[PDB]
């Protein structure tokens, strides 16, 4: 709850900074007066590589176990599949401009 106290203090002080930015000047003086496809490919590309990152990233917590051969095997299989997806969109001229 200590970090909740930190989040609360930072949020409240930042809101006070925003209200100093807005409601400070008391001198109320004079009030006066299409999308593309290739944007969308980048987001889903990021999304699927992020999902395979989520699959990869608990690797170093796993490094203390006995079945080292299967670990190294499926780890190389995961990075290889990720690079195969990248090479697939690379050779099928997908993310090009």
């Amino acid at each position: 709850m200590n970090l909740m106290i930190t989040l609360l203090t930072n949020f409240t002080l930042a809101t006070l900074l925003v209200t100093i930015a807005f409601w400070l000047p008391q001198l109320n003086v004079y009030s006066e007066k299409p999308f593309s496809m290739k944007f969308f490919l980048v987001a889903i590309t990021f999304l699927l590589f992020d999902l395979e990152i989520a699959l990869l990233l608990p690797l170093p917590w796993a490094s203390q176990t006995t079945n080292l051969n299967t670990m190294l095997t499926m780890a190389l299989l995961l990075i290889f599949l990720l690079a195969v997806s990248l090479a697939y969109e690379w050779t099928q001229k997908g993310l090009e401009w």
């Binding site: 001198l27 003086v29 004079y30 006066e32 007066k33």
Partner: protein, 156 residues
């Protein structure tokens, strides 16, 4: 009396903070824009005074009109002028800008820039020397020094 003392010191503080830096937007149509770039030179720094060249209109402190205003340019000129924060000051640089200049007796040339925006500093020359423009900006700072804004608010 002591409230007058507080208002005087606070007004002097905020006017000092305004006259501290004053980054403009470099509007700059003709050869007076080249001389604005040459008062951005190493031999004459704007950056010694807090003056920064920045074409962001929504954070423009003052505005330097420099060049030859035309009839096709003027509506876009005031449309740029109105999307600016409310403390605003105008430096007319150049013989063309401060009264038409060499293209005065001509169509398609607005006779100066009094006919569009209010003007605060006139610095003449063709081009005004970077020396002279910087003297004009210092005189602008001293105009900001003499403003008594919050004193007039207090005796209002």
């Amino acid at each position: 009396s002591r409230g007058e003392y507080v208002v005087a010191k606070l007004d002097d503080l905020i006017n000092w903070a305004r006259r501290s830096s004053l980054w403009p937007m470099t509007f700059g149509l003709a050869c007076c824009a080249v001389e604005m770039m040459h008062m951005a030179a190493p031999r004459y720094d704007m950056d010694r005074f807090g003056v920064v060249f920045r074409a962001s209109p929504r954070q423009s402190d003052v505005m330097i009109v420099a060049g030859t205003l035309t009839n096709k340019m003027a509506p876009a000129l005031r449309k740029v002028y109105d999307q600016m924060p409310e403390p605003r000051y105008v430096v007319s640089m150049g013989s063309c800008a401060n009264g038409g200049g060499y293209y005065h007796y001509s169509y398609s040339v607005v006779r100066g820039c009094d006919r569009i925006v209010p003007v605060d500093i006139y610095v003449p020359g063709c081009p005004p020397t970077a020396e002279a423009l910087l003297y004009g900006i210092l005189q602008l700072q001293k105009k900001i020094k003499r403003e008594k804004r919050l004193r007039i608010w207090y005796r209002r």
